[PDB]
Every structure is written in structure tokens, then in C-alpha cells.
Design a protein around this ligand. Structure first.
Ligand SMILES: CC(=O)Nc1nc(C)c(-c2csc(N)n2)s1
Ligand SMILES: [Cl-]
Ligand SMILES: [Cl-]
Ligand SMILES: [Cl-]
Ligand SMILES: [Cl-]
Ligand SMILES: [Cl-]
Ligand SMILES: [Cl-]
Ligand SMILES: [Cl-]
Ligand SMILES: [Cl-]
Ligand SMILES: [Cl-]
Length: 173
């Protein structure tokens, strides 16, 4: 239909971002494909975006999956989502030095914890070892969250708009 011809709607974008993370991480977890997706919020991720390959791409579960396929140019690092775009892939993030992080967790988890210690980003990790999905926020790790738990956290942290009249002009950034 005609809606979408002239712009996009922030709450549609936010729910689509959540759905894209949920579907891609489920797809990857079932197949034991590791992944690392960091969603920028109020704290900028711009410097870490610059360390990766720029994509500036529309968000989809399909593109997120294709990025993380092992042994490919884009898989070795973080995807960073900024606004309504996959900004970069194969980005560096700071590694946490915390001795509280379990030694059985790998670089993706330590990078997710590291970025969470210095930004307000929300970061999602898929373990290649177990398929467990984890999330970091504010220096804390939520390990092996269920699909229901992941859904509730993503809604609370990434949706900032309630049920209201749709408009391409809402909450401009
Ligand atoms: C200082 C430093 O190394 N930072 C890193 N960030 C990320 C996102 C990394 C990563 C994920 S998966 C892989 N092979 N490497 S390493
Ligand atoms: Cl429109
Ligand atoms: Cl839209
Ligand atoms: Cl898909
Ligand atoms: Cl498809
Ligand atoms: Cl580092
Ligand atoms: Cl892993
Ligand atoms: Cl297994
Ligand atoms: Cl589950
Ligand atoms: Cl309008």
C-alpha cells in the first residue's frame, strides 16, 4: 500500500528491530552460529562503527543471519545498529577485563560486556558453543535468556513509543 512511500514510523522501526533480532538470533542459536549485535542508544557508538565495514543497511533478520555466517568477510566482529540501520559489521568493541565474567565464555561475551560498561547500548550475543542467547546492559550480563525473557527485555529497552496515531514525523532524531 501507499504508507511507507514518504517516510517511516519510529514505533514500526523499533518493533521491527526487535523482531529482526529475535528471528535472526533464534535462527543462529539453533544452528550454533555465533553472533554479536550491539544496539546504540543515548551513548554514541560512532567510533566503534568506524572500526567495521560500513553497511548503512535496512534492518532485516535475513541480513543479520547472512552477516554472521562463519568464515566470511563480515562475521569477525560486532554488528552495530544505529537508528533504523545496520550501521556496520565486523566492528571492534572494548573487551571487559572483569574477573567476574566466567572463563567458559568467549570473546563475543567479553566484548558485549566491555561495550556495556562504557555505553548505554543493549548488546545481544549468541554462543557458538551452546546456542544460548545472552544480553549485556550497564555492565551486567543476562546469560542464556529464554525467548520470553529476551522479548520482554528488548521491548522494555528498545521500544520508546506507546500505542498512538502513526506518523512519519514522530520523535525525529
Ligand atoms: C580489542 C578487541 O579485540 N575488541 C574486539 N571486539 C570484538 C567485537 C570482537 C570479536 C567478536 S568475534 C571475534 N573473532 N572478535 S574482538
Ligand atoms: Cl508514507
Ligand atoms: Cl513505516
Ligand atoms: Cl529469517
Ligand atoms: Cl527469507
Ligand atoms: Cl579492549
Ligand atoms: Cl561464543
Ligand atoms: Cl550442541
Ligand atoms: Cl527459550
Ligand atoms: Cl502524519
Amino acid at each position: 500500500g501507499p504508507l511507507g512511500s514518504y517516510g517511516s514510523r519510529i514505533e514500526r522501526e523499533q518493533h521491527h528491530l526487535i523482531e529482526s533480532i529475535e528471528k535472526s538470533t533464534q535462527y543462529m542459536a539453533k544452528r550454533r552460529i555465533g553472533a554479536l549485535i550491539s544496539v546504540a542508544r543515548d551513548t554514541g557508538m560512532d567510533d566503534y562503527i568506524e572500526t567495521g565495514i560500513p553497511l548503512n543497511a535496512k534492518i532485516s533478520s535475513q541480513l543479520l543471519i547472512n552477516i554472521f555466517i562463519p568464515n566470511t568477510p563480515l562475521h569477525d566482529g560486532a554488528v552495530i545498529i544505529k537508528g533504523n540501520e545496520i550501521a556496520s559489521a565486523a566492528s571492534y568493541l572494548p573487551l571487559s577485563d572483569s574477573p567476574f565474567l566466567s572463563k567458559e565464555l568467549g570473546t563475543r561475551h567479553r566484548a558485549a560486556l566491555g561495550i556495556s560498561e562504557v555505553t548505554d547500548s543493549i548488546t545481544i550475543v549468541v554462543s557458538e558453543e551452546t546456542g544460548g542467547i545472552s544480553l549485556t546492559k550497564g555492565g551486567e550480563l543476562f546469560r542464556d535468556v529464554s525467548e520470553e525473557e529476551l522479548h520482554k527485555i528488548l521491548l522494555k529497552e528498545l521500544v520508546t513509543v506507546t500505542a498512538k496515531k502513526p506518523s512519519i514525523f514522530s520523535k525525529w532524531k
